[PDB]
Design an enzyme around this catalytic site. Sequence first.
Site, PDB file in Angstrom:
ATOM      1  N   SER D 246      57.273 -30.943  -7.757  1.00 31.83           N
ATOM      2  CA  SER D 246      56.358 -32.092  -7.434  1.00 31.83           C
ATOM      3  C   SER D 246      57.093 -33.085  -6.824  1.00 31.83           C
ATOM      4  O   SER D 246      58.432 -33.307  -6.934  1.00 31.83           O
ATOM      5  CB  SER D 246      55.527 -32.476  -8.331  1.00 31.83           C
ATOM      6  OG  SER D 246      54.624 -31.596  -8.761  1.00 31.83           O
ATOM      7  N   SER D 284      54.493 -26.963  -6.881  1.00 31.27           N
ATOM      8  CA  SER D 284      54.791 -28.354  -6.729  1.00 31.27           C
ATOM      9  C   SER D 284      53.822 -29.263  -5.832  1.00 31.27           C
ATOM     10  O   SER D 284      53.744 -28.920  -4.740  1.00 31.27           O
ATOM     11  CB  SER D 284      56.229 -28.099  -5.704  1.00 31.27           C
ATOM     12  OG  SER D 284      56.568 -29.378  -5.734  1.00 31.27           O
ATOM     13  N   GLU D 286      53.083 -31.840  -3.786  1.00 31.08           N
ATOM     14  CA  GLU D 286      54.101 -32.626  -2.840  1.00 31.08           C
ATOM     15  C   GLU D 286      52.891 -33.454  -1.999  1.00 31.08           C
ATOM     16  O   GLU D 286      52.071 -33.015  -1.231  1.00 31.08           O
ATOM     17  CB  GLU D 286      54.954 -31.877  -2.055  1.00 31.08           C
ATOM     18  CG  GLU D 286      55.724 -30.870  -2.926  1.00 31.08           C
ATOM     19  CD  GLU D 286      56.994 -30.236  -2.492  1.00 31.08           C
ATOM     20  OE1 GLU D 286      57.237 -30.385  -1.188  1.00 31.08           O
ATOM     21  OE2 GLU D 286      57.671 -29.597  -3.111  1.00 31.08           O
TER      22      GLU D 286
END
EC number: 3.4.11.25
Lengths: 361, 365, 367, 367
Positions: D246, D284, D286
């Site tokens: 992340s 992740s 993002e």
Amino acid sequence: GPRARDLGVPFEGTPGALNAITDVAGVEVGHTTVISGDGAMVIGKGPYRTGVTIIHPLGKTSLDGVAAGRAVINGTGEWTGMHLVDEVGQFLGPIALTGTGNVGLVHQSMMDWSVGKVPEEALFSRLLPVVAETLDNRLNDVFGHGLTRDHVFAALDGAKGGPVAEGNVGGGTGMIAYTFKGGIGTSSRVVSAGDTRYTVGVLVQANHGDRNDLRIAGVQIGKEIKGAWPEVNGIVAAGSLLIVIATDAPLMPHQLERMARRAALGVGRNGSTAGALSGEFALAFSTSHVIPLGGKPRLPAIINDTDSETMNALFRGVVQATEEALVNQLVASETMTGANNAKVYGIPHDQLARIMKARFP
Amino acid sequence: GPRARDLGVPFEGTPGALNAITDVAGVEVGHTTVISGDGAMVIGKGPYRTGVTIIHPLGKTSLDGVAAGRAVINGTGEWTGMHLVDEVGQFLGPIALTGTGNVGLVHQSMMDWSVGKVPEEALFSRLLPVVAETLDNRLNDVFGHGLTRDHVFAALDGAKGGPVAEGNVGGGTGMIAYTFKGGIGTSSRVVSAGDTRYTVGVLVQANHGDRNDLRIAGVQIGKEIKGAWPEVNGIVAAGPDAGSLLIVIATDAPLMPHQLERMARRAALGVGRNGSTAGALSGEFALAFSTSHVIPLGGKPRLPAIINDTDSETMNALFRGVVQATEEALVNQLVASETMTGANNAKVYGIPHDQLARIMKARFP
Amino acid sequence: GPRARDLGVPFEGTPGALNAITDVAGVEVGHTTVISGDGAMVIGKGPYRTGVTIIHPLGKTSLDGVAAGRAVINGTGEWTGMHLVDEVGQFLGPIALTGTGNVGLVHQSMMDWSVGKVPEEALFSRLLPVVAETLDNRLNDVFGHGLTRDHVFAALDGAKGGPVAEGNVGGGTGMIAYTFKGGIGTSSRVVSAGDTRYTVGVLVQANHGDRNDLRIAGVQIGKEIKGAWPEVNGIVAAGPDAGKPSLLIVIATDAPLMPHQLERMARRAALGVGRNGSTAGALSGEFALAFSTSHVIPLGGKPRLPAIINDTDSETMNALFRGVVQATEEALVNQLVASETMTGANNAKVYGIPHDQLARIMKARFP
Amino acid sequence: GPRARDLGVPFEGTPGALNAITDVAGVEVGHTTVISGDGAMVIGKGPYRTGVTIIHPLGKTSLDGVAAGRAVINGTGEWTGMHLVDEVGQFLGPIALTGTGNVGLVHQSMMDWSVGKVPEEALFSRLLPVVAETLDNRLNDVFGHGLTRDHVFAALDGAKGGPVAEGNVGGGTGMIAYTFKGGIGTSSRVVSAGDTRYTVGVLVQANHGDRNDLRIAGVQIGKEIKGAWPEVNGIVAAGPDAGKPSLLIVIATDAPLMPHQLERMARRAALGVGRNGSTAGALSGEFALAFSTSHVIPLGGKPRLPAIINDTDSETMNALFRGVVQATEEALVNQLVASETMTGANNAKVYGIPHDQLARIMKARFP
């Protein structure tokens, strides 16, 4: 002929003087209506029941952009120029509303029109025409090249303010709504925020919905109407939606997206449920938030999104004007026989007036 | 007690057996209702009129995800877990519906519940709880910590299938809708496409709209009802005198995430039927999930059949189901919610049953 | 002729056999390239440097849809059929990539082609052709009707599998990228997702970016190349010595992905673009479209999804995502290498990135 | 201590004076860093390696909103207040960046802080706090209630302008990026938009990426660095010698941008991330959030927009967009350099990217 209020249909709010999108000053509308041929359809030969509707947000001689934002109810359809609106919050040039088979011809014809009407130095701005469609497949030879460049130029050049013709005209010519005859409808609201007034104007090209779902002024009316089911050669055969919103409120693009998202609530009032293959779309623009070509945007005043009094007045205007534009369309559209001798009835005026008088004495 | 149909309100389509979201088999719902104190509001001391509603898509012992999709009518509000749903088309764990002031407490409490109920090896999956809110600010001490972890655990653990309590319960306890008492409502539709049948269930937490816009079965009813305007003190607060919306859709149809987004986008049409215009500060949201398209933790998604988006017979049946169940869930809420007096002696009336029944009889003889 | 790897440019990952989008089985590509006239531009009379590129996801005889999802880096451009993709997660018919002035002609021509090729009962399905553009306005008479219906039909009918021509062809004919000659590029990756190896293929029509930002294999190369700035009649038109003598990304995969998963694929293209240095110009229409050739939707029938992938299966998904990033990165460089110097409308001259200099720089950096 | 430029890493563009998000005037940043315990993790008993970072867009005493817009690279994570941003184009109150297990506590603590700091008449405006997370699961007891309300209040009250501490602090304390130690990084750019020079400031909380993909100034550096792979009790845990002995992006600008323009800014972060090689993992989260400190919305009043910018003014917009890309690229490398080696929960040891080796590689590459 009569509009919906003339047949006794009640609506909420205060309409503008024209009760049309052209109550927003400077907006111009033009139609070219193509009605030719009868009998069996042969692709490339008609019959034709089609056309194009043009809306110039700032009038036909403007080179400036308008602030704009869109919404999608169900995206099974085409509306060009929308990636541009989502990205930079404005579009240049007019909006064209037409039949599905005409999109490419209209798109190129708008470019050709620009070459003839815009200075060469400004042509860069004319690259992303705004063209939207609904499908006139029962009444029209969709693939048969019935619309010509000259038809498009005529609507572009012929557009004007003042009263807007409704019903079986322009892009709405061959359309079918709620199993009755579809077409063009328009309405407006003058809204109040304290001492400030703004106008919200709406124009629809209606080709959506089922008779069994239709509500007019809340009345589930399909079963109350006798007859008027579609036919083919004489045999009873039974039993997309484009929304353009104009306002003079000085709204930013993200605020116009909010306006466009209110159209669905007005559509919902009239009963439809957004068919899986129904391309149902809304586009909203401001005529006071204007962007001169290559210059600074002109935003003459600014509204806070959390100012409930102002925003809710504008949102209610969109809902009510959308609701009424839809009914105005149905009343304006007359019975038509088109390709393959398919016949679609206008919602019957005598029966509608009788039902409205019984429900609203 | 009577629901909307029992007072003579007509609706289109065919309800499920319970006419509730739990007509979608395996769904469980629980409420904790917090009603304490009377009189002047003092932040941190009440009065409290709040709570939490839990919906377990596959029941409280499931560790699996459900396919999901969402829609936003007006996004001035909070609903956690939604970036996850937009990205990967599923969520894990329950949905919690609550008051605005309780969101953080509920979010952490759901994590604490997971620690106690889920094997430590599966805890990775429990990091994005789904928590949504509407604002109980007139009747409740929003900022005053009236909801506790124990209240949340009780709703999580107490959830069940079968009939769902409506009205002033759980997350809806302190809510106001159409200037009448707001709260929880639910409805369902059993829909057909050829020989196949599916259920669409809807639960709402309603805190939206104005009396002047309300339509019930198409009837603009606020001006036909006499009295029942709110009081702020002992005097009339709105109308003449002084003398947000959360929608959860479940279906057993085996829909992919993008198809559930389509389902969620139909909720607005149902809301539209009932007359509101999405206030600028009204957080109006919809979340749809499938109970047959399930994603076992760390395994292969189970999609037992597949539907074409361009199959109008099937899809339109499902869409119409969402519209109708949403419309009815909203009216069911109003009928279930009783008059309440809360913080600052604010009084909000339940829509009057006697008058509603009379109006419906006159309109639909 | 040489592609980027042949000039010594290193890339990560394993390409498919053709290192092209047609490494995804059944995909067909066709180009029509229109090059006529020289000198001063008069609208309607050229010069013309334009064309169209056609991609048939399941081949030119298919009436079926493919699962699809899209992403927008910067939306100042046109790509039709994308509302449909966002709504129902599939599109029918071919993808056309062309110049901005050709969009309407191509859209109507694709409908006309369907009338000739598709059973009447299937025509309903051919109403939303997929047509995308970049702007060839420096080298081409954009508004001058240089592209004809017969050009479009030729690309539709001529499309095939196997090696894909790159450079100054089809929709890329008149394009400019990183202040060098733009055009068409393609690459692929074969990616190991556990015991299964999927193919990710990418084709780009590149008309974006500035030389000052360009990175090739991480090397900021614009200042390392000498000369080759654009000109008009022998006078440099850009760069330090001036005065002196949009991006379309198409991703195919045979992975059996659902539409929301293909949106994720499309969103990875931006990271591959990012590797090569550009910053998405305000007026640069930069878009990506991803489709699956194994998740197919027979016309009016039940979708065919032969296997199903969990979005949270990082081994499988990250292999696919890395494939998109690497194939996009390489497709962009392959384009530059394939595109040769061209002089077009108003005597604008744009150089192909010089092969000798590129090879020298790569040998120095990557011995 | 040295930041990336001090170790010889080159970057494009001109930083602001502090080379930090606080180069945008009036922005304040605070951190609370929680580090306690060592050895085996027991849920509720640590070890703890966590914290919270606060960004006050207009300073801690402001009751006003800032214009804002967001972008998602990969949405597997949480960021509250974002429906509000999408709808009305502004948010009220501070941004908090923290670990995943802390979101609920931070959210309620921000409300409690408001009760104590804001007039009762303004409390309505404080009900949608902005709280974002990345997952400190390898180094921290995520579920163990290590962060307290007092920790949150201390970051809210202690925030200030001037230099911003980077590395293993605040929300970044327990993070891991590119298989090296993760954490907080920041950078800025001053960008010339004709006759006006705007500031773009970027702060990252980095917990993303793989060493095998990492690029620093275009150099694929993971295989050039020797050792420094993570360990458990002296045994290497990743990389070729395993077994042997992340992303949150916050963008501030003083440009007077409208909300849809700030979305465009946020969408540029991905290109800066792309420059450094990562490919957005499936799990992740993002995300990017951009806000303007000049386009401000007084509570219950008229928005203040002191000048207005055309989206099609490429000179101004491209200067701003390039600023976001470059500042994001540099913020990510600044984070790595600031973060030191840490051993945390379950004896997991993660190395800061080695300064001596990085400087040596940069000197060889950029002499």
